[PDB]
């Protein structure tokens, strides 16, 4: 599924990401844009055995278990397969375990390189939420 930015912003807000750990809502919508282009089925394999899954590209070596990645830690304690639905719940649940403090969004390379330092609020203005 491909979310429109406003529809995604509303869902992320309902699931508690607005100002979660001090990060305003636009940061999360911006992260999804640059990580998965708002596609809940996005996938990306990296040089390392790792593969990122879902709207927020959750990593298979540290956060979710896909059972094909060497050194799997599964800190969110959940199958990656379970992170590719149209319902963003599981992905948000894991994202909240990943971000434990105010440096936490650095967990997403794209957020760090393409959202941080930009007007992330621009991804949500005019959205009804």
């Amino acid at each position, epitope marked *: 599924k491909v979310f429109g930015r406003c529809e995604l912003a509303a869902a992320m807000k309902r699931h508690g990401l607005d*100002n979660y750990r001090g*990060y305003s809502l636009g940061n999360w919508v911006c992260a999804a844009k640059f990580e998965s282009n708002f596609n809940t089925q996005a996938t990306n394999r990296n040089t390392d055995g790792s593969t990122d899954y879902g709207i927020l590209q959750i990593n298979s070596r540290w956060w979710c278990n896909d059972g094909r990645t060497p050194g799997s830690r599964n800190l969110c304690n959940i199958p990656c397969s379970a992170l590719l639905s149209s319902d963003i719940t599981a992905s948000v649940n894991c994202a909240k375990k990943i971000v434990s403090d105010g440096n936490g969004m650095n967990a997403w390379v794209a957020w760090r390189n393409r959202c941080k330092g930009t007007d992330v*609020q621009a991804w949500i*203005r005019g959205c009804r939420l």
Partner: antibody
Amino acid sequence: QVQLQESGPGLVSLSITCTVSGFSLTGYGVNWVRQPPGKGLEWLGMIWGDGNTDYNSALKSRLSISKDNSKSQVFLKMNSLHTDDTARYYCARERDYRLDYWGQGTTLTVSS
Amino acid sequence: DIVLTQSPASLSASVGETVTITCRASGNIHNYLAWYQQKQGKSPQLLVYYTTTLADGVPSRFSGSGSGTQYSLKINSLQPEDFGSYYCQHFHSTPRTFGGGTKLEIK
């Protein structure tokens, strides 16, 4: 160790410098705010981590903000100076829509 | 531009009293409102951001609230270090503006 310090002309085109440390200008905005003696705060403008700039609408034609990421410096340039411009000028770091660290400010008096 | 109207301009209070400051925006600012405290001869310091979140180190006796176009800052049983000026500022798009300020003085 986030720090910001303003440097300026004192009495006076004008340019004020904001020298920062403890963070990268590429990841944070820097806003310029002023306060005339005994008065309130007035927003002047800002430069985002990505270089985009936005300004006070009434003052937009006389203000220019720019920066040098490698030297950790931000600059406020004002033209057509007026006595109404006499005030303490502050630069302040913006972290995700709040100004979390501010300089001590620099006083400016328009040769009047 | 969105303008902020802050009231009252001054408040005379004694340690232990509770006071409230208001800030209403001419247009919806969607929770993007922060509060600053400024002591005589010092720079403003962040107190509250995104309407209700206390900045690090700020005592819990401070509380912020509001939504849409109307916001408030409340100080419960104020202390000596609380006297000074307070300003609200919005961050909904640009340009940003500040309220006119409020001076909290000893009664």
